[PDB]
Amino acid sequence: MASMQKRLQKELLALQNDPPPGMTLNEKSVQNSITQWIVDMEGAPGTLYEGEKFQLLFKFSSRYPFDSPQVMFTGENIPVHPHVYSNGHICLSILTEDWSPALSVQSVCLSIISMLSSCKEKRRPPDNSFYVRTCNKNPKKTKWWYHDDTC
C-alpha cells in the first residue's frame, strides 16, 4: 500500500537513480503548494525532434495514482506535432482512458517520447453500425471549451 506522496517519493527516487536515456527529472517547488514536476526531454535519434529539448510539466492530484497527472509541455520549447498543442497540451490515451495506478510518470514520459517518434492516427471499426452502437460507452459532448485567448 502507498499514499499519493509515497507513490511520488518512490517514482522520484526511481527516476533520480535511473531515468530513461536523455531524460531528467527535476521536482519544482511551486507557489501553488502542490506537487509539480519538471522533466527534461531531449528528442530521440532519428526523429524530427532529435537533439532538441522540450520540457514537461506533471501536475499531481491528491487522488494520484488513481487519477492521472495533468501532463503538458512547458519551458521555452513546445514541439510541433499532431498530438501536441502550442499551449503545451498532450493528446495521449495514457492520461485519460488508459490511465491505471499500475502506470508511472516514467511510462507517461516514454509514451510522449514514442508519440513524438511516431505519430499515430485515430481509427474506428469498419462496421460503422457497430461503432455507432458502442458510442453510448463514450464520453458526452462538451459544451464549454477552454480557450487560449488573452484575458
Side-chain angles (χ1 to χ4, degrees), residues 61-97:
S61 67
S62 67
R63 288 191 292 271
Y64 183 83
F66 298 94
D67 187 346
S68 68
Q70 184 177 17
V71 181
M72 298 181 74
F73 284 96
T74 188
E76 296 181 356
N77 187 356
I78 306 301
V80 177
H81 188 282
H83 294 291
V84 179
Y85 294 87
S86 67
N87 65 10
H89 186 282
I90 300 172
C91 182
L92 294 171
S93 68
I94 196 168
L95 298 176
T96 58
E97 292 179 355

Coordinates of all heavy atoms in Angstrom, one line a residue, residues 61-97:
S61 N -2.4 15.3 -8.6 CA -3.6 15.4 -7.8 C -3.4 14.6 -6.5 O -2.4 13.9 -6.3 CB -4.8 14.8 -8.5 OG -4.6 13.4 -8.7
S62 N -4.3 14.8 -5.5 CA -4.2 14.1 -4.3 C -4.8 12.7 -4.5 O -4.5 11.8 -3.7 CB -5.1 14.8 -3.2 OG -6.4 14.7 -3.5
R63 N -5.6 12.5 -5.5 CA -6.1 11.2 -5.9 C -5.0 10.3 -6.5 O -5.1 9.1 -6.3 CB -7.3 11.4 -6.8 CG -8.5 11.9 -6.1 CD -9.7 11.8 -7.0 NE -9.6 12.8 -8.1 CZ -10.0 14.1 -8.1 NH1 -10.6 14.6 -7.0 NH2 -9.8 14.8 -9.2
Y64 N -4.1 10.9 -7.3 CA -2.9 10.2 -7.9 C -2.4 9.1 -7.0 O -2.2 9.3 -5.8 CB -1.8 11.2 -8.1 CG -0.6 10.6 -8.7 CD1 -0.6 10.4 -10.1 CD2 0.4 10.1 -7.9 CE1 0.5 9.8 -10.7 CE2 1.5 9.5 -8.5 CZ 1.5 9.3 -9.9 OH 2.6 8.7 -10.4
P65 N -2.2 7.9 -7.5 CA -2.2 7.4 -8.8 C -3.6 6.8 -9.3 O -3.6 6.0 -10.2 CB -1.2 6.3 -8.8 CG -1.3 5.8 -7.4 CD -1.6 7.0 -6.5
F66 N -4.7 7.2 -8.6 CA -6.0 6.8 -9.0 C -6.7 7.9 -9.9 O -7.9 7.8 -10.1 CB -6.7 6.5 -7.8 CG -6.0 5.4 -7.0 CD1 -5.1 5.7 -6.0 CD2 -6.3 4.0 -7.3 CE1 -4.4 4.7 -5.3 CE2 -5.6 3.0 -6.6 CZ -4.7 3.4 -5.6
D67 N -5.9 8.8 -10.3 CA -6.2 10.0 -11.1 C -4.9 10.5 -11.8 O -4.0 10.9 -11.0 CB -6.9 11.0 -10.3 CG -7.5 12.2 -11.1 OD1 -7.2 12.3 -12.3 OD2 -8.3 12.9 -10.6
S68 N -4.9 10.4 -13.1 CA -3.6 10.7 -13.8 C -3.2 12.2 -13.6 O -4.1 13.1 -13.3 CB -3.9 10.6 -15.3 OG -4.8 11.6 -15.7
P69 N -1.9 12.5 -13.7 CA -1.4 13.8 -13.6 C -1.7 14.7 -14.8 O -1.9 14.1 -15.9 CB 0.1 13.6 -13.4 CG 0.3 12.2 -14.1 CD -0.9 11.4 -13.9
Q70 N -1.8 16.0 -14.7 CA -2.0 16.8 -15.9 C -0.7 16.9 -16.5 O 0.3 17.3 -15.9 CB -2.6 18.2 -15.5 CG -2.9 19.0 -16.8 CD -3.6 20.3 -16.4 OE1 -3.5 20.8 -15.3 NE2 -4.2 20.9 -17.4
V71 N -0.5 16.4 -17.7 CA 0.8 16.4 -18.3 C 0.8 17.2 -19.6 O 0.2 16.9 -20.5 CB 1.3 15.0 -18.6 CG1 2.7 15.1 -19.2 CG2 1.3 14.2 -17.3
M72 N 1.6 18.3 -19.5 CA 1.7 19.2 -20.6 C 3.2 19.7 -20.9 O 4.0 19.6 -20.1 CB 0.9 20.5 -20.3 CG -0.6 20.2 -20.2 SD -1.6 21.7 -19.8 CE -1.6 22.5 -21.4
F73 N 3.4 20.1 -22.2 CA 4.8 20.6 -22.5 C 4.8 22.0 -21.9 O 3.8 22.7 -21.9 CB 5.1 20.6 -24.0 CG 5.5 19.2 -24.6 CD1 4.6 18.5 -25.2 CD2 6.8 18.8 -24.5 CE1 4.9 17.2 -25.8 CE2 7.2 17.6 -25.0 CZ 6.2 16.8 -25.7
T74 N 6.0 22.3 -21.5 CA 6.3 23.6 -20.9 C 7.7 24.1 -21.3 O 8.3 23.6 -22.2 CB 6.1 23.6 -19.3 OG1 6.2 24.9 -18.8 CG2 7.1 22.7 -18.7
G75 N 8.2 25.1 -20.5 CA 9.5 25.6 -20.8 C 9.4 26.6 -22.0 O 8.3 27.2 -22.2
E76 N 10.5 26.8 -22.7 CA 10.5 27.6 -23.9 C 10.5 26.9 -25.2 O 10.8 27.4 -26.2 CB 11.7 28.5 -23.8 CG 11.7 29.5 -22.6 CD 12.9 30.4 -22.6 OE1 13.8 30.3 -23.5 OE2 13.0 31.3 -21.8
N77 N 10.1 25.6 -25.2 CA 10.1 24.9 -26.4 C 9.0 23.8 -26.5 O 9.1 22.7 -25.9 CB 11.4 24.2 -26.7 CG 11.6 23.6 -28.0 OD1 10.6 23.5 -28.8 ND2 12.7 23.1 -28.3
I78 N 7.9 24.1 -27.2 CA 6.8 23.2 -27.4 C 7.0 22.6 -28.8 O 7.1 23.3 -29.8 CB 5.4 24.0 -27.4 CG1 5.3 24.8 -26.1 CG2 4.3 23.0 -27.5 CD1 5.4 24.0 -24.8
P79 N 7.0 21.2 -28.9 CA 7.2 20.6 -30.2 C 6.0 20.7 -31.1 O 4.8 20.7 -30.7 CB 7.5 19.2 -29.8 CG 6.8 19.0 -28.5 CD 6.9 20.4 -27.8
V80 N 6.2 20.8 -32.4 CA 5.2 20.9 -33.4 C 4.8 19.4 -33.7 O 5.7 18.7 -34.2 CB 5.6 21.6 -34.7 CG1 4.4 21.6 -35.7 CG2 5.9 23.1 -34.3
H81 N 3.6 19.0 -33.5 CA 3.2 17.6 -33.6 C 1.7 17.5 -33.7 O 1.0 18.3 -32.9 CB 3.8 16.8 -32.5 CG 3.6 15.4 -32.5 ND1 2.4 14.7 -32.3 CD2 4.5 14.4 -32.8 CE1 2.6 13.4 -32.4 NE2 3.9 13.2 -32.7
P82 N 1.1 16.6 -34.4 CA -0.4 16.4 -34.4 C -1.0 16.2 -33.1 O -2.2 16.6 -32.9 CB -0.5 15.2 -35.3 CG 0.7 15.3 -36.3 CD 1.8 15.9 -35.5
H83 N -0.3 15.6 -32.1 CA -0.9 15.4 -30.8 C -0.3 16.4 -29.7 O -0.5 16.3 -28.5 CB -0.6 14.0 -30.3 CG -1.4 13.0 -31.1 ND1 -2.7 12.9 -31.0 CD2 -0.9 12.0 -31.9 CE1 -3.1 11.9 -31.8 NE2 -2.1 11.4 -32.4
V84 N 0.4 17.5 -30.2 CA 0.9 18.5 -29.3 C 0.4 19.9 -29.7 O 0.5 20.3 -30.8 CB 2.4 18.6 -29.3 CG1 2.9 19.7 -28.3 CG2 3.0 17.2 -28.8
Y85 N -0.3 20.5 -28.7 CA -0.8 21.8 -29.0 C 0.2 22.9 -28.5 O 1.0 22.6 -27.7 CB -2.2 22.0 -28.3 CG -3.2 21.0 -28.8 CD1 -3.3 19.7 -28.4 CD2 -4.1 21.4 -29.8 CE1 -4.2 18.8 -28.9 CE2 -5.0 20.5 -30.3 CZ -5.0 19.2 -29.9 OH -6.0 18.3 -30.4
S86 N 0.1 24.1 -29.1 CA 1.0 25.2 -28.8 C 1.0 25.7 -27.4 O 1.9 26.3 -27.0 CB 0.8 26.3 -29.8 OG -0.5 26.9 -29.5
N87 N -0.1 25.4 -26.7 CA -0.3 25.7 -25.3 C 0.3 24.6 -24.4 O 0.2 24.7 -23.2 CB -1.7 26.0 -25.0 CG -2.6 24.8 -25.1 OD1 -2.1 23.6 -25.3 ND2 -3.9 25.0 -25.0
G88 N 0.9 23.6 -25.0 CA 1.5 22.5 -24.2 C 0.6 21.3 -24.1 O 1.1 20.2 -23.6
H89 N -0.6 21.3 -24.5 CA -1.5 20.1 -24.4 C -1.0 18.9 -25.1 O -0.6 19.0 -26.3 CB -2.9 20.5 -24.7 CG -3.9 19.3 -24.4 ND1 -4.0 18.2 -25.3 CD2 -4.7 19.2 -23.4 CE1 -4.9 17.4 -24.8 NE2 -5.4 18.0 -23.6
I90 N -1.0 17.8 -24.4 CA -0.6 16.5 -25.0 C -1.7 15.5 -25.1 O -2.4 15.2 -24.1 CB 0.5 15.9 -24.1 CG1 1.7 16.8 -24.0 CG2 0.9 14.5 -24.6 CD1 2.7 16.3 -23.0
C91 N -2.0 15.1 -26.3 CA -3.1 14.1 -26.5 C -2.6 12.7 -26.6 O -2.3 12.2 -27.6 CB -3.8 14.5 -27.8 SG -5.2 13.4 -28.2
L92 N -2.7 12.1 -25.4 CA -2.4 10.6 -25.2 C -3.5 9.9 -24.4 O -3.9 10.5 -23.4 CB -1.0 10.5 -24.5 CG 0.2 10.9 -25.3 CD1 1.4 10.8 -24.4 CD2 0.3 9.9 -26.5
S93 N -3.8 8.7 -24.7 CA -4.8 7.9 -24.0 C -4.4 7.6 -22.6 O -5.2 7.4 -21.7 CB -5.1 6.6 -24.7 OG -4.0 5.8 -24.6
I94 N -3.0 7.5 -22.4 CA -2.5 7.2 -21.1 C -2.9 8.2 -20.0 O -2.9 7.9 -18.8 CB -0.9 7.2 -21.1 CG1 -0.4 6.5 -19.9 CG2 -0.3 8.5 -21.3 CD1 1.1 6.1 -19.9
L95 N -3.2 9.4 -20.4 CA -3.6 10.5 -19.4 C -5.1 10.4 -19.2 O -5.6 11.0 -18.2 CB -3.2 11.8 -20.0 CG -1.7 12.0 -20.2 CD1 -1.4 13.3 -20.9 CD2 -1.0 11.8 -18.8
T96 N -5.9 9.7 -20.0 CA -7.3 9.6 -19.8 C -7.8 8.2 -19.6 O -7.6 7.6 -18.6 CB -8.1 10.2 -21.0 OG1 -7.7 9.5 -22.2 CG2 -7.7 11.7 -21.2
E97 N -8.3 7.6 -20.7 CA -8.9 6.3 -20.7 C -8.0 5.1 -20.4 O -8.5 4.1 -19.9 CB -9.6 6.1 -22.1 CG -10.8 7.0 -22.4 CD -11.4 6.8 -23.8 OE1 -10.8 6.1 -24.6 OE2 -12.4 7.4 -24.0

